[PDB]
Amino acid sequence: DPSAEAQPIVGSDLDDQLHGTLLGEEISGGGGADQLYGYGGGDLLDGGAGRDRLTGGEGADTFRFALREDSQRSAAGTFSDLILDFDPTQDKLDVSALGFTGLGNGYAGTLAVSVSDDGTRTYLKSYETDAEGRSFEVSLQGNHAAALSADNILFATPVPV
Ligand SMILES: [Ca+2]
Ligand SMILES: [Ca+2]
Ligand SMILES: [Ca+2]
Ligand SMILES: [Ca+2]
Ligand SMILES: [Ca+2]
Ligand SMILES: [Ca+2]
Secondary structure, three states: OOOOOOOOEEOOOOOOEEEOOOOOOOEEOOOOOOEEEOOOOOOEEEOOOOOEEEEOOOOOOEEEOOOOHHHEEEOOEEOOEEEEOOOOOOOEEEOHHHOOOOOOOOOOOOOEEEEEOOOOEEEEEOOOOOOOOOOEEEEEEOOOOOOOOOOOEEOOOOOOO
């Protein structure tokens, strides 16, 4: 709308601890180990570099990844994006800007999806290569792996997943 187009609020490359709450607008802030809570409203969040804590709550938020090496892991440490409260079975995740290697059970460079109920999280990572080919890692609080669909997750791999 001409009043607001939900333009993300540009934070800092510092560790941003900022909140969005009920505003239908959300904060972006590349660097740092951010803690960004967005609860109500439709939200548009980019976590960037580092190991981040991104909460989205309510709404069909779009948490999106142009953050490639910014969401990578190694045995020497992981810099991933741990997304909290993100499962009304209709939340939006976008990894199309990463291209995404695929979801072929974690081999041939693709990633695997797993869900742990004790963690209440569905982690997505690859493990075939670590020092040899440091893999990507993300985590989402919810069990929306049972809701794996193109409408839930946008990707740009040459084979659908
Ligand atoms: Ca930041
Ligand atoms: Ca960050
Ligand atoms: Ca919000
Ligand atoms: Ca929200
Ligand atoms: Ca949400
Ligand atoms: Ca990150």
